[PDB]
Amino acid sequence: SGFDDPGIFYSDSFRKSQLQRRFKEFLRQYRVGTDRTGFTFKYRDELKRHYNLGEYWIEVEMEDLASFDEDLADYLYKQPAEHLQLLEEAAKEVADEVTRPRPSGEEVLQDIQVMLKSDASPSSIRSLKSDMMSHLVKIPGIIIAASAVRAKATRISIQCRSCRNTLTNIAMRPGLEGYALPRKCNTDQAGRPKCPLDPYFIMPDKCKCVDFQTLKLQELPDAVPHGEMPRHMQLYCDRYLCDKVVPGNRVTIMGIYSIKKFGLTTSRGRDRVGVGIRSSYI
């Protein structure tokens, strides 16, 4: 009849998905104990208790995962960005499995932050060079500055000027990365006149927000070379990692070595010697 639009539907199906399934089985199966006294389900019970108490975070030791299956542990050491997402989805699915009979009304299943911990000996901050980009590194230091906690968006929704149509549930990228709005209104309009150029506005009240913090880390005075100025580093903290460190503490931090991504902006200032340099962080 040319008026309605019922949409699109699909049905459940009859290698990354297999990786997520492997992580889920690891979480549901892992146990620690003895043959004499049996074994206890470490991560299952831990996730159950944390979700029940309201703490949306768990900590995973890489040695346990390597014991369970070395392939996934080796994978996490090389491409943390994707396998972290897969492991978080597996943790969310397990938490849904264990705590199905929740109190009424609170049906919404929230995300879960997965932290990492290992017994590997650290390495000097001076060893950070080009070869370690996008890998997982462990570094000691002393914290000297900590900015205020701010808000950063993970899901956004935008509206059109003329026809007031909406694009919803757009996923933002983690880290210090931006987003560019589209310029064309994607609506089929025949006979109707069309929308202008650049018609989109960001709706603030319909976005998902998380905590955000930046830290300044200095090389340990115990390991600074004689007669050399100490070096510094900038750290990114998200969600539950905020407020865990006070300036002046001596900390060991495991993270990913990255660069900021805010587009191909032109260099500024009266000095323009450097070409193709992106500010780095962890």
């Binding site: 009849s1 040319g2 539907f9 699909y10 459940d12 990354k16 998905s17 997520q20």
Partner: protein, 565 residues
């Protein structure tokens, strides 16, 4: 406005309630039996009467009348929910579509745990698994409307119309829901259709393809798709309802699965339908805004004794007309002023399948058939197939029409070979013709009746008295039964025994001998014997006898003698 849940519950209880009506004189659970049959493939569509609902709640009926489509969907969902309760056994024999439905339900039970979260897009479309259709019957209190007066006030309502059929479309499948398979996954994608045209999809919305970001591409399938039977109908007003000096108006109807193949061109029909628009996108127009075209969606389509007692006299001609109607070609030639046209009009009105032509108005393309945007549409001779055709002022027709009529009478098929048309048409119809005062009529036709106006005083006075009675009291001096009697009569087929042949043979020979004695006689041939045999068989059929008898042969001989004299 009222919540749909309460009315859905009311619909369910109404379907579960009624016990009242039974044909055999009892109290029978009708809707329960209908639902039990619906559980398996013993019934593939259900019709709901809005007169039975009126007993308990008329506001439901009014809301159904004004908002018919929403209530149709609600009824469909309610019946689908009720179906599992009434089911008692698995299908004894099932076809391809049932095999898909069973397999999909089985794997849905296999995979989906009761507690896992399911996206609103992850469900099956309602109409894909459904295999039964619901239609409504117009209220008896509701008065049928006229094609001319349905307007914007009637868009979206439930209406009942009566009209004449002029155009019918051949059956073709119509898409309901399209099924897609991804290039790199086992998932299935469903696309509902509610538009005259649609744009096929490309990428796969399945969860696995999304998680892997594989970029798999969809492909259509025809086996998994759902198709329905679709037909297009054209209707016109009766000549009675047209105002002064105007022309009949037309409307367009769409016809669904079981309602398909009910109506034929030239039939008078009553249609219960919903009046809905179609959004039109195309050539630019003068006035801005949203215009639309209207059309009708159907849910139900519904289609010796005295012959012309108003006309005085011609009793033997009336008997011959009765025999022609009953069956096993009659021509009348008369002076002007004798009502020959009115007999043909009565014959046209009485016959189930009939056509009536007046002369050059229906000449040429009005007969035979022609090609129109391509489909071939027939004329009066084609429409009257297996019926009776009536032609007035036969002698004034063009020669081509007369040749076509002769071909229909003798060969019973039409052959057309012209630029763009090369066909043979089946016309198994008997012809009644009228004319004014030739060897062609005697040789080709079976029975000729010559009506000569001899001015006898007594006959003229009686005719005047009868006409005055008709004009004054509007009724003759002291059809459904006739139609039923003819229908019952035509069911049987008598047979000719071996012995009577000799008698018949003798008669024929003697008749021809007399015709050879009277040199003024014109025609006797085996065609006359065939006509006599056919008339005797028709009379035996009237008596419902298995074996031809003597009285039928005598009456046929007497009728032929009266016609010839």
């Amino acid at each position: 406005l009222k919540d749909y849940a309460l009315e859905k519950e009311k619909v369910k209880k109404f379907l579960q309630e009624f016990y009242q009506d039974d044909e055999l004189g009892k109290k029978q659970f009708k809707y329960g039996n209908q639902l039990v049959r619906l559980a398996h493939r013993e019934q593939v569509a259900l019709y709901v009467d809005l007169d039975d609902v009126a007993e308990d709640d008329p506001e439901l009926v009014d809301s159904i009348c004004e908002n018919a489509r929403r209530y149709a969907k609600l009824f469909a969902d309610a019946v689908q929910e009720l179906l599992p309760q009434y089911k008692e056994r698995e299908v004894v024999n099932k076809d391809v579509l049932d095999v898909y439905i069973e397999h999909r339900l089985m794997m849905e039970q296999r995979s989906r745990d009761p507690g896992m979260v399911r996206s609103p897009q992850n469900q099956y479309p309602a109409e894909l698994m459904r295999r039964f259709e619901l239609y409504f019957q117009g209220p008896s209190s509701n008065k049928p409307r006229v094609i001319r007066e349905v307007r914007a006030d009637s868009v979206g309502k439930l209406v009942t119309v009566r009209g004449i059929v002029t155009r019918v479309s051949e059956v073709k499948p119509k898409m309901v829901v399209a099924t897609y398979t991804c290039d790199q996954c086992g998932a299935e994608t469903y696309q509902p259709i509610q538009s005259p045209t649609f744009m096929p999809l490309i990428m796969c919305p399945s969860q696995e393809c999304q998680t892997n970001r594989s970029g798999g591409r969809l492909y259509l399938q025809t086996r998994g798709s759902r198709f329905i039977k679709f037909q297009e109908m054209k209707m016109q007003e009766h000549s009675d309802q047209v105002p002064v000096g105007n022309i009949p108006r037309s409307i367009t109807v769409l016809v669904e699965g079981e309602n398909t193949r009910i109506a034929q061109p030239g039939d008078h029909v009553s249609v219960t339908g919903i009046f809905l628009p179609i959004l039109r996108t195309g050539f630019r127009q003068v006035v801005q805004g949203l215009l639309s075209e209207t059309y009708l969606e159907a849910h139900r389509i519904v289609k010796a004794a005295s012959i012309a007692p108003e006309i005085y006299g011609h009793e033997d001609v009336k008997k011959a007309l009765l025999l022609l109607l009953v069956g096993g070609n009659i021509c009348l030639m008369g002076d002007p002023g004798v009502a020959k046209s009115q007999l043909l009009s009565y014959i046209d009105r009485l016959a189930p399948r009939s056509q009536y032509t007046t002369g050059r108005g229906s000449s040429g393309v009005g007969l035979t058939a022609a090609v129109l945007r391509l489909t071939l549409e027939g004329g009066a001779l084609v429409l009257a197939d297996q019926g009776v055709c009536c032609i007035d002022e036969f002698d004034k027709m063009a020669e081509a029409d007369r040749t076509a009529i002769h071909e229909v009478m003798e060969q019973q098929t039409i052959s057309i070979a012209k630029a763009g048309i090369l066909t043979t048409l089946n016309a198994r119809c008997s012809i009644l013709a009228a004319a004014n005062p030739p060897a062609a009529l005697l040789s080709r036709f079976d029975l000729l009746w010559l009506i000569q106006d001899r001015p006898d005083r007594d006959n003229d006075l009686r005719l005047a008295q009868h006409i005055t009675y008709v004009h004054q009291h509007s009724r003759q001096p002291p059809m459904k039964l006739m139609r039923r009697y003819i229908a019952m009569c035509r069911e049987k087929q008598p047979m000719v025994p071996e012995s009577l042949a000799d008698y018949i043979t003798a008669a024929y020979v003697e008749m021809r001998r007399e015709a050879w004695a009277s040199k003024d006689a014109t025609y006797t041939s085996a065609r006359t014997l065939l006509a006599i045999l056919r008339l005797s068989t028709a009379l035996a059929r009237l008596r419902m006898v298995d074996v031809v008898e003597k009285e039928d042969v005598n009456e046929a001989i007497r009728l032929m003698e009266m016609s010839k004299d």
